[PDB]
Design a protein around this ligand. Sequence first.
Ligand SMILES: *[C@@H]1O[C@H](CO)[C@@H](O)[C@H](O)[C@H]1NC(C)=O
Ligand SMILES: *[C@@H]1O[C@H](CO)[C@@H](O)[C@H](O)[C@H]1NC(C)=O
Ligand SMILES: *[C@@H]1O[C@H](CO)[C@@H](O)[C@H](O)[C@H]1NC(C)=O
Ligand SMILES: [Cl-]
Ligand SMILES: [Cl-]
Ligand SMILES: [Cl-]
Ligand SMILES: [Cl-]
Ligand SMILES: [Cl-]
Ligand SMILES: [Cl-]
Lengths: 94, 232
Amino acid sequence: SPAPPRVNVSLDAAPAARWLPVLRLFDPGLLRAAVARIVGDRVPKWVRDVIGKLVAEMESFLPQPYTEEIRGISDFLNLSLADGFIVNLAYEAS
Amino acid sequence: CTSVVAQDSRGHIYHGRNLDYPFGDLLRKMTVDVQFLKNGQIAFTGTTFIGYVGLWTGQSPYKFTVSGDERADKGWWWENMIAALFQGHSPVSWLIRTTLSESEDFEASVYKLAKTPLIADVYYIVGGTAPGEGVVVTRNRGGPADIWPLDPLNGAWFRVETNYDHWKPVPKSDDRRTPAIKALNATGQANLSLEALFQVLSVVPVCNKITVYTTVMSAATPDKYMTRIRNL
Ligand SMILES: *[C@@H]1O[C@H](CO)[C@@H](O)[C@H](O)[C@H]1NC(C)=O
Ligand SMILES: *[C@@H]1O[C@H](CO)[C@@H](O)[C@H](O)[C@H]1NC(C)=O
Ligand SMILES: *[C@@H]1O[C@H](CO)[C@@H](O)[C@H](O)[C@H]1NC(C)=O
Ligand SMILES: [Cl-]
Ligand SMILES: [Cl-]
Ligand SMILES: [Cl-]
Ligand SMILES: [Cl-]
Ligand SMILES: [Cl-]
Ligand SMILES: [Cl-]
């Protein structure tokens, strides 16, 4: 049983940019494909498009700094803001 | 999931948890131990997955440790969910991380985890730095259904939480509670330690095919925070 990587995340850095040192650990290209596929198959496209508009329009009114952090993860991985938001809320969606 | 908060014969608090989740083939590769830095210091430590901003396992050094287990709720619509987000409700993993970032001490963290409204049900297991500082907080969306504390002076030196309410019998099909109690019963209060608790969390079926990682921790000894990937 190996130990996971141990990485620092600075809360002094911008929310959108503080997770990048961690995102470069795993293969980001493989992570984008894995997220885009699994969210694509379980969530229809029309729902995802609506989820995107709501989150982007009401970014100021959703909890922080989590939403701005999900915005920076999805931008780095070239995911739709809906894709990044659905995976981060995968527990509640169940 | 299996979380355990326990107390040894000296008054030291130990906290451990197993994270079981399907798709674990992928998650095991994405598990990281994150140290969140603030103002040139380690504000808190957490175990998460790449791309996930919440914490299901975390530590506030010399203050408290927290882990979250899943609780089955009423059917929730995705429309009602977004409403809950805008209504002001919080995801269960985001409250854990907020508490680790804001709460000043153990008792204040238990208050935050118990009262804050949530989008879904959950179990919050919290451990502290002083004797008797251990609780299993059974949560509804609205508030606390129960608060199960450690009672060492009466022989209850450990609390075990799986994914079912502790005052009801567990399903015969998914009974990971009694083997975790048997292993803790066999270990004994005097022999309890982080490594002895890791051994308990390595027992089958407490550790099974879908287990992703195991964490043992104690806010009083924050340097001993250790996570292990399982079935890798
Ligand atoms: C994390 O920060 C600590 C001090 O805050 C430093 O000693 C350590 O090298 C850092 N580790 C990584 C992986 O950045
Ligand atoms: C994402 O797209 C940017 C260009 O916008 C590119 O530089 C980067 O390599 C891409 N990364 C992935 C993981 O697709
Ligand atoms: C654990 O030990 C106590 C003895 O103090 C006993 O009463 C209880 O039934 C035991 N539980 C299990 C599951 O073995
Ligand atoms: Cl912040
Ligand atoms: Cl209230
Ligand atoms: Cl409820
Ligand atoms: Cl249980
Ligand atoms: Cl039950
Ligand atoms: Cl120890």
